[PDB]
Design a protein around this ligand. Structure first.
Ligand code: BEF
Ligand code: MG
Lengths: 32, 289, 996
């Protein structure tokens, strides 16, 4: 049916998008 | 200071070069728009002129009423002619489009089964076929309430009554529940070609149950006939007349207010706790006289 | 009648020192050597007040905390909170939705304000905490005589009119009239700014009672000798008591920053009410019945005011003033951090301030040649050629001959800033010995002191004799230092390269002209001489005595002069070289003497080598001074004599027609009206000091500066800044930072403000064309205050776009923090294109699911009715309530996504105001982190589970992000070609209209 979206995977995935970005910056702001 | 109103060779603030600031702003906004306007014009060539690209949000259709009251509460007086006029003017204009002389041109209408029939697939959802005929609808199939000249009129002046209508959903081949009905309460063995609903004093506990209901349908069933589903959309079927369904409350204590939930069952039908109107239906009533 | 009291305090004081000691003995009622009995003194100690300052009259309790709760912007935002609750009103009553809507906002507003003030109060209380840990008041007890009998009672039981006896080391308990003395030099550096220690005596000398000799002054300490004298003024009646209180009793004056805060609130709220309030008039002006026509005003107008910037600001300053906290220079208040960058004039005191207030060897005379010592405090300077024997001799001379000695714990301290109980000349001399020619511990114990002669009364000579540890000539050694004129009289033989000679009148006038040359350079000169004794006439065992001439007083062997002056702090001169490089006038004010002040200021460059005063032009022409046109002297020296005798427009003409100004001999109060005078020009003024004559000038300056160790206590609580290490190079940092932090904030404000255009424009048209609510408040809360937080802070760490110490200081009138171009920029063009993309972001979604754009006109009416569960689109689909509201809050959530996106373009293009971002680069770390974190917070918020349930915001379908792309793009493109054309042709058009 065209009336059921897989919302849970793109959700599992922006959260991945969010951490990596969020942690790249924690690798960006502590250059040591 | 606070007096730069009309300064020499200058108005309040600046002005000798206003034409400069102003002209820049017209081009700019005139160009901020010819961009944006491009962009939305783009966005408009990618919308299927026929099917909604995204339909997932209406996943569970719902049950609405004809007298879309203030708060699903029908509070009237079976006496004062005006106590009930908001409500029956709304009923009078709702089915203004379902009288048989309105639907005279056979060119766009066709005479379908007068019994709940099978899915009238008229092709595919593209425009290769011409304009599809619309199955017709005779006030007859709604009895004792606006069933023509026999009774009705007071439209519920005495024992209150109301039509339930499904939300047109482009494409909905509504799937009803199979003959193994997972607790569908008292209903007849016509579970094949029709989609049902029923109403209750209260939800899932003890109830101020006070009511004897009587349902009116196409040939006399309690639901929705499949020979009119799913809708082919407004551009492909104008003036299309979706199934309506009428429920009547006879034995009503008058000076007290109870509640009534009308649910609708099917794999193709679902329910939401946050939306009391998804898949089910709520109305409170008070025949105060 | 206390302003009349505040005014006889900006006036020079007056007294009565010029009387016969008998006329003295008649007025006050007391004896000269026997004093007043102690039942009369138990009758005067309670007729008024014990010799004591009324404690600082300022004691605000911890309820002073509502101060950081109001002000200019917080109190300008204060209304908003109440307005929200005022808009909250109807919801509470009429069954609507006050439960969780217009109530949380109020809490948020309050909490936000609360935070803003709970954090700019906490700091301003960890810096009133770390300056109250330096006040070590050791109370010092007066030697008071009472019923003849020297009775040293506590510093607090003494009275006007009984004797007090100072010896060496006793702080002066109060203001006296010397009636007797013996070699009594006291040190008033702390009270009037006089440098070298000043002698005290009973006869009557000058008339300005400060510089006179028969009067001492509280807080100054008696350096040497002993004196007797009579107490004139007690308690708050002293001179440093008239001055502490007038210091205490003037206004801190507004800082140019909270001002650029105010004219911003003028424009913020200025258009806020002008548009919004007048714009909801329009709501009811169309046809909306009054009753519910303004039922949405509380909120739609709320977006216009930029909630959040309040926090972003009090941090951009907090990070700056944590960096100045790492270089040893504390701000008592926040906003003063900037002030220095806007300084066009810097007053600065001589003693204790510009200098070390410690006598130190300056120049030296040997072999008819002058040698400049090292005169700094951290030994980074020029050391003379210490190879000649003339030096070796002159050295052991000064080393052997001194009463001065090191204290026990004086080893690990710098050889100069360490302590010396003893004289000044003997301290500075002992000092330049232990540094230039080895240690003085084993050189003053190698020679056995036979008979000494301390400083005498007639002539000038201090002398001693020792025996011979050398192996060559076992003859005896004699040494003597004394005045050039009175030691040139008793001398005859000379010394060079190890062999003697006699006095020729050629080198006696090369001596009379490098005494008058070294002495005319402000330096107190001292000759040094020695002689051998005829060891045939006095044997190797004859212990001489102290009764008669035991050795030749004439035909001695002179060696060399030796000069000393109070030398500047090391970091002083370069600090000033930068001062004027940035075009800051540097004027010098000091209560010191015009020849010592003429030599120090030429030495520092306030007066560049080479302006002649009105006086250098007149002794050189050999004409009367009244002859030269003051127009031709670019520099000038003014004796505070003429100064009492002077008005405003006059003072107006001096500061105006004179670049290099040095004021001399000015009472504490006379430094006020100086600050106040450089303040009748419209410029801002930055004052730096040491003792208590600055308390008034340090408080009335836009900002006052003090010293930490070398300072006193009445101008360390009045100044608005303190210098802990006493390093004066740190000021060079401060005009650089306030000028920079200036230019960054300008970027910072324009960032959050641009937000405010796609912020409200939604609440606007939503009323215009009757469409659904394209953006929510919750959304409005996570930008002004949620994501936009860290990027508006990362922009505070932006670096410099040209040479900052190159451009002259800002004109407080012209260069506006928020000038009218920024708004034509942030509110004018960017926020517009900004609105453009969120709204483009807004149509695609209602269109893609099913609601075409031309369809949505007039819609919101049926769409905000909680009961219309059948709502047709253009495709003919019927939609319930919670369904299309769900489509609403996810037209809330990505609009916000689209925002941050353009907020990318914005933050990247506000980073530089003039320079292409490819020349300035993304070297800003935090700013990268900002990009990363802001996106992450955002993307965390939409996709987090039960986010639709809590905040009314759901996961986005993927094809939504990239909709703000060519916009944030065209944005970056627009401002970059903007910031290139300004680099090419600034003079014509472009720059003038835009450049914020
Ligand atoms: F202390 Be300063 F020389 F006025
Ligand atoms: Mg000083």
């Amino acid at each position: 049916d065209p009336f059921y979206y897989d919302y849970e995977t793109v959700r599992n995935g922006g959260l991945i998008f969010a951490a990596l970005a969020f942690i790249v910056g924690l690798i960006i702001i502590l250059s040591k | 200071f606070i007096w730069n109103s009309e300064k020499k060779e200058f108005l309040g603030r600046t002005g000798g070069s206003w034409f400069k600031i102003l002209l820049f702003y017209v081009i700019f906004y005139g160009c901020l728009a010819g961009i944006f306007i491009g962009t939305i014009q783009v966005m408009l060539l990618t919308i299927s002129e026929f099917k909604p690209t995204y339909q997932d949000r209406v996943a569970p259709p719902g049950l609405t009423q004809i007298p879309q009251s203030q708060k699903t509460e029908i509070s009237f007086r079976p006496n004062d002619p005006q106590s009930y006029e908001s409500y029956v003017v709304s009923i009078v204009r709702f089915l203004e489009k379902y009288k048989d002389l309105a639907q005279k041109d056979d060119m766009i209408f066709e005479d379908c089964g007068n019994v709940p029939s099978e899915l009238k697939e008229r092709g595919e959802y593209n425009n290769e076929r011409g304009e599809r005929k619309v199955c017709r609808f005779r006030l007859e199939w709604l009895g004792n309430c606006s069933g023509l000249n026999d009774e009705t009129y007071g439209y519920k002046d005495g024992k209150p009554c109301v039509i339930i209508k499904l939300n047109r959903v482009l494409g909905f081949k509504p799937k009803p529940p199979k003959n193994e009905s997972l607790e569908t309460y008292p209903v007849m063995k016509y579970n094949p070609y029709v989609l049902p609903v029923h109403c209750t004093g209260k939800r899932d506990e003890d109830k101020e149950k006070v009511g004897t209901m009587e349902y009116f349908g196409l040939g006399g069933y309690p639901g929705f006939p499949l020979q009119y589903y799913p809708y082919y959309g407004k551009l492909l079927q104008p003036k299309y007349l979706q199934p309506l369904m009428a429920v009547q409350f006879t034995n009503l204590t008058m000076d007290t207010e109870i509640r009534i939930e009308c649910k609708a069952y099917g794999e193709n039908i679902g329910y939401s706790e946050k939306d009391r109107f998804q898949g089910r239906f709520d109305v409170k009533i008070e025949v105060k006289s | 009648k206390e302003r009349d009291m505040d005014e006889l305090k900006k006036e020079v004081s007056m007294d009565d020192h010029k009387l016969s000691l008998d006329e003295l003995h008649r007025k006050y009622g007391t004896d000269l050597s026997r004093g007043l009995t102690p039942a009369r003194a138990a009758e005067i100690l309670a007729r008024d007040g014990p010799n004591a300052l009324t404690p600082p009259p300022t004691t605000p309790e911890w309820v002073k905390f509502c101060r950081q709760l109001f002000g200019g912007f917080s109190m300008l935002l204060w209304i908003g909170a109440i307005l929200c609750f005022l808009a909250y009103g109807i919801q509470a009553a009429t069954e609507e939705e006050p439960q969780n809507d217009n109530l949380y906002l109020g809490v948020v507003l309050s909490a936000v304000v609360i935070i803003t003030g709970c954090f700019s109060y906490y700091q301003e209380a960890k810096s009133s905490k770390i300056m109250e840990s330096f006040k070590n008041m050791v109370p010092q007890q007066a030697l008071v005589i009472r019923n003849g009998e020297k009775m040293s009672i506590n510093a607090e039981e003494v009275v006007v009119g009984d004797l007090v006896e100072v010896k060496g080391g006793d702080r002066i308990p109060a203001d006296l009239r010397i009636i007797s003395a013996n070699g009594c030099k006291v040190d008033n550096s702390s009270l009037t700014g006089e440098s070298e220690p000043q002698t005290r005596s009973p006869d009557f000398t000058n008339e300005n009672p400060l510089e006179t000799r028969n009067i001492a002054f509280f807080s100054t300490n008696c350096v040497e000798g002993t004196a007797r004298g009579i107490v004139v003024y007690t308690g708050d009646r002293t001179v440093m008591g008239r001055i502490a209180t007038l210091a205490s009793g003037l206004e801190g004056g507004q800082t140019p920053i909270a001002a650029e805060i105010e004219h911003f609130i003028h424009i913020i709220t200025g258009v806020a009410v002008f548009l919004g309030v007048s714009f909801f008039i329009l709501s009811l002006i169309l046809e909306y019945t009054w009753l519910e026509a303004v039922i949405f005003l509380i909120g739609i107008i709320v977006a216009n005011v930029p909630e959040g910037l309040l926090a972003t600001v009090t941090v951009c300053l907090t990070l700056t003033a944590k960096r100045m906290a790492r270089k040893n220079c504390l701000v008592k208040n926040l906003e003063a951090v900037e002030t220095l960058g806007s300084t066009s004039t810097i007053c600065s005191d001589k003693t204790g301030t510009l200098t070390q207030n410690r006598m130190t060897v300056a120049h030296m005379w040997s072999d008819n040649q002058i040698h400049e010592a090292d005169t700094t405090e951290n030994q980074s300077g020029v050391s003379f050629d210490k190879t000649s024997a003339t030096w070796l001799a002159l050295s052991r001379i000064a080393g052997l001959c001194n009463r001065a000695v090191f204290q026990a714990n004086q080893e690990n301290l710098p050889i100069l800033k360490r302590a010396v109980a003893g004289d000044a000349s003997e301290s500075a001399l002992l000092k330049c010995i232990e540094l230039c020619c080895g240690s003085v511990k084993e050189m003053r114990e190698r020679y056995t002191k036979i008979v000494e002669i301390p400083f005498n009364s007639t002539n000038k000579y201090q002398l001693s004799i020792h025996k011979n540890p050398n192996t060559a000539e076992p003859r005896h050694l004699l040494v003597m230092k004394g005045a050039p004129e009175r030691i040139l009289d008793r001398c005859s033989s000379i010394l060079i390269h190890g062999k003697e000679q006699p006095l020729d009148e050629e080198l006696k006038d090369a001596f009379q002209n490098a005494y008058l040359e070294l002495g005319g350079l402000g330096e107190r000169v001292l000759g040094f001489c020695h002689l051998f004794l005829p060891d045939e006439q006095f044997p190797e065992g004859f212990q001489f005595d102290t009764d008669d001439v035991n050795f030749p007083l004439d035909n001695l062997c002179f060696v060399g002069l030796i000069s000393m002056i109070d030398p500047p702090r090391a970091a002083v001169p370069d600090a000033v070289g930068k001062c004027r490089s940035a075009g800051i006038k540097v004027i010098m004010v000091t209560g010191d003497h015009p020849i010592t002040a003429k030599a120090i200021a030429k030495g520092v460059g306030i007066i560049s080598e080479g302006n002649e005063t009105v006086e250098d032009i007149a002794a050189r022409l050999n004409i009367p001074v009244s002859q030269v046109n003051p127009r031709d002297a670019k520099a000038c020296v003014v004796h505070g004599s003429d100064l009492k005798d002077m008005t405003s427009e006059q003072l107006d003409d001096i500061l105006k027609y004179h670049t290099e100004i040095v004021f001399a001999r000015t009472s504490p109060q006379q430094k006020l009206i100086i600050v106040e005078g450089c303040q009748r020009q419209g410029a801002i003024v930055a004052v730096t000091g040491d003792g208590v004559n600055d308390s008034p000038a340090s408080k009335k300056a836009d900002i006052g500066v003090a010293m930490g160790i070398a300072g006193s206590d009445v101008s360390k609580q009045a100044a608005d800044m303190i210098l802990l290490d006493d390093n004066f190079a740190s000021i060079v940092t401060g005009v650089e930072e306030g000028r920079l932090i200036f230019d960054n904030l300008k970027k910072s404000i324009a960032y959050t403000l641009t937000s405010n255009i796609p912020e409200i424009t939604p609440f606007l048209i939503f009323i215009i064309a009757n469409i659904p609510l394209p953006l929510g408040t919750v959304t409005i809360l996570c930008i002004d205050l949620g994501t936009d937080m860290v990027p508006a802070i990362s922009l505070a760490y932006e670096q410099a776009e040209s040479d900052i110490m190159k451009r002259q200081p800002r004109n407080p009138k012209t260069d506006k923090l928020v000038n009218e171009q920024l708004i034509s920029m942030a509110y004018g063009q960017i926020g517009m294109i900004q609105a453009l993309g969120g709204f483009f972001t807004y149509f695609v979604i209602l269109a893609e699911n099913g609601f075409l754009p031309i369809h949505l006109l007039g819609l919101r009416v049926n769409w905000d009715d909680r009961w219309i569960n059948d709502v047709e689109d253009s495709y003919g689909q019927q939609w319930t309530y919670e369904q299309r509201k769900i489509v609403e809050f996810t037209c809330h959530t990505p609009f916000f996504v689209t925002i941050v996106v353009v907020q990318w373009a914005d933050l990247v293009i506000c980073k530089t105001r003039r320079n292409s971002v490819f020349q300035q680069g993304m070297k800003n770390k935090i700013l990268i982190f900002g990009l990363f974190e802001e996106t992450a917070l955002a993307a965390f918020l939409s996709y987090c589970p039960g986010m639709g349930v809590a905040l009314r915001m759901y996961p986005l379908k993927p094809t939504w992000w990239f909709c703000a792309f060519p916009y944030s793009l065209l944005i970056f493109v627009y401002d970059e070609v903007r910031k290139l054309i300004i680099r090419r042709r600034p003079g014509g058009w472009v720059e003038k209209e835009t450049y914020y």
